[PDB]
Amino acid sequence: STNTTDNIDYFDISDESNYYLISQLRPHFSNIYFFDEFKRYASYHTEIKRYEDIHKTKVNSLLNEASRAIGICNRAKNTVKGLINILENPQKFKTQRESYDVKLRQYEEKKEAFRGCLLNKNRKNLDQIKKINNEIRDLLEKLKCSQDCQTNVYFDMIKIYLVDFKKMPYENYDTFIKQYKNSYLSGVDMIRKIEKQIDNPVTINAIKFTQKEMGYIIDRFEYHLQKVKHSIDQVTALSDGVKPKQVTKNRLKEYYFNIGNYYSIFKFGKDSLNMLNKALIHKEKIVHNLLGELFGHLEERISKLIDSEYFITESNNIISQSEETLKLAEDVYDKNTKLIEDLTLYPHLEINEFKKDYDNNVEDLRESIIYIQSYVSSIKSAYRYNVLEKDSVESKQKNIPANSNAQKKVDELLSIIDSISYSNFSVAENFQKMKDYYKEIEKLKIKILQLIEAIKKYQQHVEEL
Amino acid sequence: FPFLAYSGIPAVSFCFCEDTDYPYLGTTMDTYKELIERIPELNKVARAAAEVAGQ
Amino acid sequence: AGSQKDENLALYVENQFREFKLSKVWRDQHFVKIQVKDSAQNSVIIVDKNGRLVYLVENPGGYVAYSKAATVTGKLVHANFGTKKDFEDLYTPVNGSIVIVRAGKITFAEKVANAESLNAIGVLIYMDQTKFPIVNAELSFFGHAHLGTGDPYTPGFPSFNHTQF
Ligand SMILES: *[C@@H]1O[C@H](CO)[C@@H](O)[C@H](O)[C@H]1NC(C)=O
Ligand SMILES: [Ca+2]
């Protein structure tokens, strides 16, 4: 589906003074939008025809110089596009021989190289912009009224600007960047956890680079949205207002220059927000295309961990050996029990002194066997709690929606991997306990064999009485 | 309690406590998952506690 | 307390307090004495009057801090909560014996302090069905038995190196 990025013109740079912002979109300045709005301001005022003459010359010269500089750096845009379409896909990387790190370094150098070539050609047009602004100041101070002028272009064109402000959508962009940014930071939080378990570096380096680019485009979008909201608040804030009918001539000059600047910020911000919305949706689709490759390799890690952690086969080995020991000892007592029964009839008739010891041996026999049954019941009990700890994880794995759109399945698999990690402290202590008990079964096994030996020595002694 | 009794500084401690106490505090089984099966949703509750202390 | 991962969480919290740009961030360290488990294992184990045969109950994972390291034998008496009124209403006298209590209603140290005041020998502490409803019965837990607070081996003065211990 989507594996590449076609548009690059969201990249930009401002000046070192941060006063003028260049865009790679048309017409690269908000001041040109100011020049068109002051052209219609000069369509009002009959006295200033020199502005529309000059304005024709300046849109010609400025647009030609701008698109010229976009040509000279269009070749550098082709190189940077080459490194981007190397870095975004794994499939373009698997044919590539150089490792990832130096390619990332080359991406950095071509990036600031691109911004540097853009600004260094646009400086000579910035000086021309300063010339135009000074010519507009002189050309506006050509006119006549230095006492009361009127301030009908202000009181009308504000209402036209408010119609234009209610035309343009704000809340969908705001809700979009809030929900989207929440999904982005949640994404980076998923990457930091997902890096430790999955073994392949190539795909996760592609995702990490992609989220870096997403971070830059998010930062630009919050910048332009901030400029739009501030310009709307300033124009409507002047429309609240005290509404003076009378201004001085210089006050009229900074007056018109002021609101023309604000509406210029609105127009430039509109087109910038439009393009950045498209770019964020595209890169978001790239990220889902990558995680779609990732989660199939993730599930194998889960299927290894569930068998690996809960010590389940070793615990079944302990239970099998313990039940085998109980069956063995109970078999031996069932073998000797009639010989016990005769050798409880021989004591009470005669000299009881050795038979006191043998009575102690019989009590130790039956009490020992009852102890072994109690130990087996204890081990089986703790094993039951352990199996329950495993089965809750299995039910949590089976209750996932397939049916995830999008990338929430990776979040669910991280949740279940987090669950297997949480069971560790209870599982380890239960298994340690099982080891302790089986040691005590061993001790009672050596003791019970010495008991049956004591029974046989007693048996030959009673034959010797 | 050492801030109140020993040093004489006023002190406050508040809990969203169930009628019976929490079943496992100093415990190996106290994890996140078992907390989130005790309490179904946690973000609004800890939000309420942070609102009280911040206020 | 004092483990490596605790210092990793400490440096994490400190780097967070620097990244929030607070007005001042400072740490403080001092050396205390706590009680930890030994390599040998503590156990509770049934002894018959015959003495030939000895049955083990369990080997607890959890331990009680500031308990006295010793080994004792004796007859056991149930002592429901160790409340002083509860100790007042016993049937069998308590002395020279090992009490068992249920965890609740008071700190562990007041249980051990009260049963020490009636001259018992040892305290065993558990959790029952009714007060603590849980699925697992093999669950083990942790407590401390110091009446009053603070590091006990410096009462009243702080545990720096300026006091020279
Ligand atoms: C303490 O208990 C023992 C029984 O173990 C008993 O012999 C003794 O008389 C008791 N102490 C007093 C002061 O009665
Ligand atoms: Ca102290």
Closest CA to A38 of A208, A263, A206: A263
Tokens of A89: 């896909």
Q: How many CB atoms lie within 10 A of CB A2?
A: 12
Q: How far is the CA of C103 from the centre of ligand 1 (A)?
A: 28
Contact A208, A191 (CB under 8 A): yes
Question: Is there an atom of ligand 1 within 6 Å of C136 CB?
Answer: no
Does domain C41-165 fall into CATH 2.30.30.60? no
Q: How many residues does chain C have?
A: 165
| Secondary structure of residue C65 in the 3-state scheme | strand
Q: Give the number of other CB atoms < 10 A from CB of residue A129.
A: 17
Chains that touch C (3 or more CB pairs under 8 A): A, B
Reported as half-sphere exposure (CB side, CA atoms, 13 A), residue A417 has a value of: 21
Indicate the length of chain B as a whole number.
Answer: 55
Would you say C109 and C145 are in contact if contact means Cβ atoms under 8 Å apart? yes
Three-state secondary structure along A292-304? HHHHHHHHHHHHH
Query: Which residues does A141 contact at the CB level (< 8 Å), separation at least 6?
Result: A249, A250, A253
Q: Which residues pair with A13 in a beta bridge?
A: A22
In the block, tokens 């210029």 appear at: A264
Q: What is the DSSP letter of A347?
A: G
Element (H, E) at B46: helix B43-54
Kind of pairing between the strands at C44-47 and C54-58 = antiparallel
HSE-up (13 A, CA, CB side) for residue C15? 6
Distance CA A208, CA A214 (A): 10
Instruction: Answer for the pair C129, C114: CB distance below 8 angstroms, yes or no.
Output: no
Measured in whole angstroms, how far is the alpha carbon of residue B3 from the centre of its chain?
18
Is A287 within 8 Å of A210 (Cβ atoms)?
Answer: yes
Residue C123 has phi, psi (to 5 degrees) of: -125, 130
A419 near A393, Cβ under 8 Å?
yes
Interchain contact, A436 vs C59, CB within 8 Å: yes
**CA neighbor of A336 nearest in space, from A423, A454, A237:** A454
List CB contacts (< 8 A) between C58 and chain A: 433
Alpha carbon distance A243, A241 (integer Å):
5
- Residue found under tokens 């150098």: A109
Q: Could you please report the per-residue DSSP string of A139-187?
A: HHTTS--SS----SHHHHHHHHHHHHHHHS--HHHHHHHHHHHHHHHHH
- Return the axis-axis angle of helices A31-44 and A50-72, rounded to nearest 10°: 160
The C-alpha atoms of residue A314 and residue C128 are separated, in whole angstroms, by: 31
Q: Please state how this structure was obtained.
A: cryo-EM
Residues 6+ away with beta carbon under 8 Å from A108: none
Tell me which residue of A213, A211, A205 sits closest to A90, measured CA to CA: A205
Distance CA A366, CA A459 (A): 18
Nearest CA to ligand 1 atom 11: C95
Of C69, C75, C81, C58, nearest in space to C128 by CA:
C81
Among residues A284, A264, A286, the alpha carbon closest in space to that of A23 is found at A264
Residue A151 is encoded by which pair of tokens?
């301030």
Is residue C4 lining ligand 1, measured as CB closer than 6 Å? no
> Which one, of A184, A15, A1, A10, lies nearest residue A81 by Cα?
A10
Reference A460, options A343, A367, A382, A368; nearest CA is A343
φ, ψ for residue A41, nearest 5 deg: -60, -35
**CB A360, CB C50: distance < 8 Å:** yes
Farthest CA pair distance, chain C: 71
- The identity of residue C49, as a single letter, is K
Contact A365, A451 (CB under 8 A): yes
Tokens of C150: 């603070």
Which pair of structure tokens corresponds to residue A429?
Answer: 């202590």
Ligand 2 (ion): residues with CB under 5 Å are C 151, 154
Residue A208, CA distances (Å) to A201, A203, A303 in order: 10, 9, 26
The type of residue at C102 is: R
Burial zone of B48 (CB within 10 Å; 0-12 exposed, 13-18 middle, 19+ buried): exposed
Q: Which residues of A touch B31 (CB under 8 A)?
A: 422, 425
Resolution (A): 3.7
**Dihedral sign, Cα of residue A163, residue A165, residue A170, residue A172:** positive
| CA A108/CA C145 separation, integer angstroms | 61
Contacts of A318-324 with CB under 8 Å at 24 or more apart are A318/A379, A318/A434, A318/A435, A318/A438, A319/A376, A319/A379, A319/A380, A319/A383, A321/A438, A322/A375, A322/A376, A322/A379, A322/A437, A322/A438, A322/A441, A323/A376
Cβ pair C34, C65 in contact under 8 A: yes
CA atoms within 13 A of residue A157's CA, in its CB half-sphere = 18
Tokens 């997403």, located at residue? A214
Nearest by Cα to C33 from C163, C158, C153: C153
The sign one gets for the Cα dihedral A74, A75, A81, A87 is negative
A204: nearest Cα among A213, A192, A216: A192
> A207: Cβ–Cβ under 8 A, 6 or more apart, which residues?
A191, A287, A290, A291, A294
d(CA C90, CA C81): 12
* Eight-state DSSP code of residue A13: E
Q: CB–CB of B23 and C134 under 8 A?
A: yes
Q: Are A445 and A325 in contact (CB under 8 A)?
A: yes
Q: At what angle do helices A249-309 and A100-140 cross, to 10 degrees?
A: 160
Q: Decide: C158 in ligand 1 pocket, CB within 6 A.
A: no
Contacts with C37 from chain A: Cβ below 8 Å: none
Point out which residues pair with A22 in neighbouring strands.
A13
Residue of C125, C121, C130 lying closest to C108 (CA atoms)? C125
- Token pair 């087109």 in the structure block, residue: A271
In the block, which residue shows the tokens 């849980």?
C134
- In chain C, whose CA is at the least distance from the CA of A363? C53
Report the alpha-carbon distance of residue A39 to residue A49 in Å, rounded. 9
Of A145, A289, A278, nearest to A220 by C-alpha is A278
**Chain B: residue nearest C132 by CA?**
B23
Look up residue A193 and give its amino acid. K
- C144: three-class secondary structure by DSSP: strand
Sheet holding C76-78, edge to edge: C76-78, C98-102, C122-126
Q: Please list, in sequence order, all residues whose beta carbon lies within 8 angstroms of the beta carbon of residue A268, skipping any fewer than 6 positions away.
A: A23, A29, A30, A33
Q: What is the DSSP string of A42-59?
A: HHH-SS--HHHHHHHHHH
Cβ atoms within 10 A of the Cβ of A444, count?
19
Start-to-end Cα distance in chain C: 20
A203, A90 in Cβ contact below 8 A? yes
Helix locations, A93-152, DSSP H: 100-140
Q: Phi, psi at residue C47, to the nearest 5°?
A: -110, 125
Q: Which residues of A touch C44 (CB under 8 A)?
A: none
**CA atoms of A433 and A386, how far apart (whole Å):** 12
Q: Is the CB of C96 under 6 A from ligand 1?
A: yes
Q: Yes or no: say if C100 and C124 are a contact pair by the CB < 8 Å rule.
A: yes
